[PDB]
Design a protein around this ligand. Structure first.
Ligand SMILES: Nc1ncnc2c1ncn2[C@@H]1O[C@H](COP(=O)(O)OP(=O)(O)OC[C@H]2O[C@H](O)[C@H](O)[C@@H]2O)[C@@H](O)[C@H]1O
Ligand SMILES: [Mg+2]
Length: 341
């Protein structure tokens, strides 16, 4: 709420991401999740820090702490903060591949911090959603689309060297960027994202990366078009959403899904009790898709939090989350340091 890039939007963004991670972690990897059972489960969140966060939040915190420490993007600082955060607490639920990147970055002889990510998966790079799950702080630090794209990509490339992974990080950072600007139609929001992704996916390196994996040309653009069709479709079922967009570990099977959850839930849903506000119903809906509920809800929550603001962050939900106060302090610090208030 309030003006574009207000303090409330910054606080709401990081709190929404934290809620998604902590509340979504209960259903992580559940093939199916019944909506009625989700509504039952958030009852427990009704009137501290009993819900632990996962690698989504741990990496998001390290990314933001690097930006605040250098008041800029600093590849060596950020890479080392990622690796040291893993070292301090390896059990947060990290992807199996990315741990190899952290161990290489922990070797002090490693003096080109982008090269471990490039060796992943026979030298093609990861397409997992880890670059996107943590990227929201980039859009808090940087106001222009140009800088958002540039540093979403660079921060993602520290672990995700495939364009299929870093273009998902860019897409997620662009969605947070737009949400921070305030009121929009769902169709205008989608159309702006589609325009940006069509520009990026025209690049020769993106086309090659997709072709080598057997995928369609312009995989994010294709899924954003599918979002537009789904938003106009009657009687959309969870099975249809998952079939067209995904609910998986790959960035292309989870970032468009998170954006769909945000856009769909801009409007009331008769299936979700009206006692829940817009941020709450976005998180409930995201978790009801099952699969990678932790990361899909974290990303949908970052977008919804930026759009709806801190007034929609329920205190009873927030105070259930490990580290909610540190998350809030980091949001306020980003607003002061970068937004220069
Ligand atoms: N090019 C590839 N070829 C084959 N498999 C791949 C490729 N890229 C990724 N994978 C598979 O994707 C896996 C993860 O890629 P990773 O880079 O390790 O980690 P993340 O940080 O993105 O974590 C992704 C989620 O996993 C957890 O839930 C986290 O919380 C994240 O939400 C690999 O182990 C491979 O099986
Ligand atoms: Mg996780």
């Amino acid at each position: 709420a309030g003006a574009a890039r207000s303090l409330s939007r910054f606080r709401g963004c990081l709190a929404g991401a934290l809620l998604g991670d902590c509340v979504g972690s209960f259903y992580e990897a559940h093939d199916t999740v019944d909506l009625t059972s989700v509504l039952r489960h958030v009852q427990s969140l009704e009137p501290t820090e009993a819900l632990y966060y996962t690698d989504d939040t741990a990496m998001a915190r390290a990314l933001v702490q690097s930006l605040l420490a250098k008041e800029a993007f600093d590849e060596v600082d950020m890479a080392h903060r990622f690796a040291q955060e893993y070292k301090k607490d390896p059990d947060r639920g990290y992807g199996a591949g990315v741990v190899t990147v952290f161990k290489k970055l922990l070797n002090p002889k490693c003096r080109d911090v982008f090269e471990p990510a490039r060796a992943q998966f026979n030298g093609k790079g990861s397409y997992g959603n880890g670059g996107a799950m943590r990227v929201a702080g980039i859009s808090l630090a940087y106001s222009s689309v140009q800088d958002v794209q540039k540093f979403a990509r660079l921060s993602a490339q520290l672990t995700h060297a495939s364009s299929l992974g870093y273009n998902g990080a860019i897409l997620q950072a662009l969605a947070v960027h737009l949400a921070l600007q305030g009121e929009s139609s769902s169709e205008h929001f989608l159309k702006q994202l589609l325009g940006h992704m069509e520009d990026l996916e025209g690049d020769a390196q993106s086309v090659l990366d997709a072709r080598e994996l057997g995928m369609e040309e312009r995989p994010y653009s294709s899924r954003l078009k599918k979002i537009g069709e789904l938003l106009d479709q009657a009687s959309v079922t969870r099975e249809e959403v998952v079939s067209e967009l995904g609910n998986g570990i790959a960035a292309f099977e989870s970032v468009p899904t998170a954006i769909y959850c945000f856009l769909r839930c801009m409007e009331p849903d008769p299936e979700i009790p009206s006692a829940f506000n817009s941020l709450q119903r976005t998180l409930i809906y995201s978790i009801s898709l099952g699969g990678e509920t932790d990361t899909i809800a974290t990303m949908a929550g970052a977008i919804a939090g930026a759009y709806y603001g801190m007034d929609q962050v329920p205190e009873s939900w927030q105070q259930s989350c490990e580290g909610y106060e540190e998350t809030d302090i980091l949001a306020q610090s980003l607003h002061r340091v970068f937004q220069k208030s």
